[PDB]
Amino acid sequence: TATGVAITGSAPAASMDATLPAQLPISAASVQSTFTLNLKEIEESKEQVT
């Protein structure tokens, strides 16, 4: 604060501007995907697919 008082003044109150935190968490979740494919079906898929 920069207020106006006088020139025979009285030295006004303190100011002390502030900074703040943000803290933004990341370490909780994940995005995943699965296949679950057999071993016999990948062998006949080199035959009945053109």
Partner 1 sequence: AFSANGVYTLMRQLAQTSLYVDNFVVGCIPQLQLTTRKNVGVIKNIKV
Instruction: List, as one string, the DSSP characters of the chain.
Output: ------SS------------------TT----------SSHHHHTTTS--
Query: Least CB distance from residue 4 to partner 1, whole Å?
Result: 12
> By CB under 8 A, which span of 7-15, 19-27, 31-39, 40-48 interacts with partner 1?
7-15
> By CB under 8 A, which span of 6-14, 15-23, 25-33, 36-44 interacts with partner 1?
6-14
Does residue 24 bind partner 1 (CB under 8 A)? no
